[PDB]
Amino acid sequence: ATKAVCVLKGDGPVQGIINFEQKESNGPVKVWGSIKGLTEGLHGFHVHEFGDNTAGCTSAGPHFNPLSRKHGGPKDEERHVGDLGNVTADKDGVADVSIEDSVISLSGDHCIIGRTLVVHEKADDLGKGGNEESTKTGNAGSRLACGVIGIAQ
Amino acid sequence: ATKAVCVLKGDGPVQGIINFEQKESNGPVKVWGSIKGLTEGLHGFHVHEFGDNTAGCTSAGPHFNPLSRKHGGPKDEERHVGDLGNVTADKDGVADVSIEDSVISLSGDHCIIGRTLVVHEKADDLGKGGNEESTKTGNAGSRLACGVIGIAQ
Ligand SMILES: [Cu+2]
Ligand SMILES: [Cu+2]
Ligand SMILES: [Zn+2]
Ligand SMILES: [Zn+2]
Predict the structure, then answer these.
(1) B50–A152: do the CB atoms touch at under 8 Å?
(2) Outcome of residue 85 to R (chains A, B)?
(3) B59 CA to centre of ligand 4 in angstroms
(4) What single-letter DSSP state applies at residue B61?
(5) Residues of A numbered 5-44 whose beta carbons fall under 8 angstroms of chain B's beta carbons: which are they?
(6) In sequence order, what are the residues at sequence separation of 6 or more whose Cβ sits closer than 8 angstroms to the Cβ of residue A132?
(7) Does the annotation list B71 as a binding residue?
(8) What is the rounded CA–CA span in Å between residue A93 and residue A133?
(9) Which residues on B lie below 8 Å from A50 (Cβ)?
(10) A51 and B151 Cβ atoms separated by less than 8 Å
(11) CB of B80 within 8 A of CB of B63?
(12) Separation of CA B103 from chain center
């Protein structure tokens, strides 16, 4: 798996398409695409553990966290494998996503293929909210849109 | 990955949920669940190559076929890794799926996690339709509903 893709959908008007590319095995992973229907500003953005959409986005479960760490920001050291921090929405509620990250992988046992990607109601506080919940979801809030991450051409 | 799941959706009224379980590494894989909104009778049922739903189900691409074989039935020897043959709809258009298969896998390089599952308009003819198209799609027809296959709890 060099490439992947994911279509985000939800009950909301929120929706988008996000691509992944890992040119090198165990190298970094460019993540990019575009989401629309967001409130202007920051929104949390994570890979969650399961490709389950049985019961909407709640089925996805908690943040993908195979090394059992506390939640954090993507550049933080103590973080969930799935913690990609935030994405930023336009005036117009379009967020033009573009991220490199080398904690996640499309191969290996950090492989995120088959897991749900989720964009959230509010900003991820990157674990620095000082409340119980911040070291788990980053207080990112409810799950506005999501989709399973799949192997792309 | 012991278990997986996939939610089938489409433009049609067709929809359902399908589960997967592979108790042994490289063993067989129980596939079961239920789909509704079908025309009574047989309907083709395959894993296609890609977890792409960019442009509905067409983005999924051709049948998952990593050994470059000709299309067949699931118990046939010459078959696509993704050829699970058919599923059967009620009077009421509910199909109660239940299948063992050991060509597909949730691990290894027949891993189908991250690929689209698709249920089709007509019956898969298992390659025996004698026409060009029958050794590719089994003449199964258009793509009524589909979804990416993801890692389940
Ligand atoms: Cu999250
Ligand atoms: Cu097909
Ligand atoms: Zn997290
Ligand atoms: Zn086939």
Answers:
(1) yes
(2) In ALS1; ubiquitinated by RNF19A; interferes with zinc-binding; ubiquitinated by MARCHF5; leading to the degradation of mitochondrial SOD1
(3) 16
(4) -
(5) 5-7, 17
(6) none
(7) yes
(8) 26
(9) 150-153
(10) yes
(11) yes
(12) 13
CB B123 within 8 A of CB B43: yes
> At A149, which CATH number?
2.60.40.200
For B55, counting Cβ atoms within 10 Å of its Cβ (0-12 exposed, 13-18 middle, 19+ buried), the class is exposed
For chain A, the residue count is: 153
Place of tokens 């009778």: B41
- Helix and strand numbers (H, E) in chain A are 0, 9
**DSSP for B100-128, written as a single string:** EESSSBSSGGGB-TTSEEEEESS---TTT
Query: Can you tell me the distance from the alpha carbon of B80 to that of B65, in angstroms, rounded to the nearest whole number?
Result: 5
Q: Identify how the structure was determined.
A: X-ray
How many C-beta atoms surround the C-beta of residue B23 within 10 A?
Answer: 10
Q: Which domain holds residue A34?
A: 1-153
Q: Residue A24 is encoded by which pair of tokens?
A: 């090198």
Dist CA B25 CA A109 (whole Å): 16
CB A135 within 8 A of CB A80: no
Exactly one of B43, B71, B79, B110 is catalytic; name it: B71
> Which parts of A1-153 are beta strand (E)?
3-8, 15-21, 29-36, 41-47, 83-89, 95-101, 116-120, 143-148, 150-151
User: Partners of B112 in the beta sheet?
Assistant: none
Q: What's the resolution in A? A: 3.5
Give, as residue ranges, everything with CB less than 5 Å from ion ligand 2: B 46
Q: Which residues of B140-149 are buried (b: 16+ CB within 10 A; e: fewer)?
A: beebbbbbbb
* B150 in A contact zone (CB under 8 Å): yes
> Alpha-carbon distance A132 to A114, whole Å?
29
- Sequence-ordered list of residues with C-beta below 8 angstroms from that of A122, at least 6 positions apart, any chain: A42, A43, A44, A139, A140, A141
- The residue type found at A51 is G
Greatest distance between any 2 Cα atoms in chain A: 42
How many domains would you assign to chain B? 1
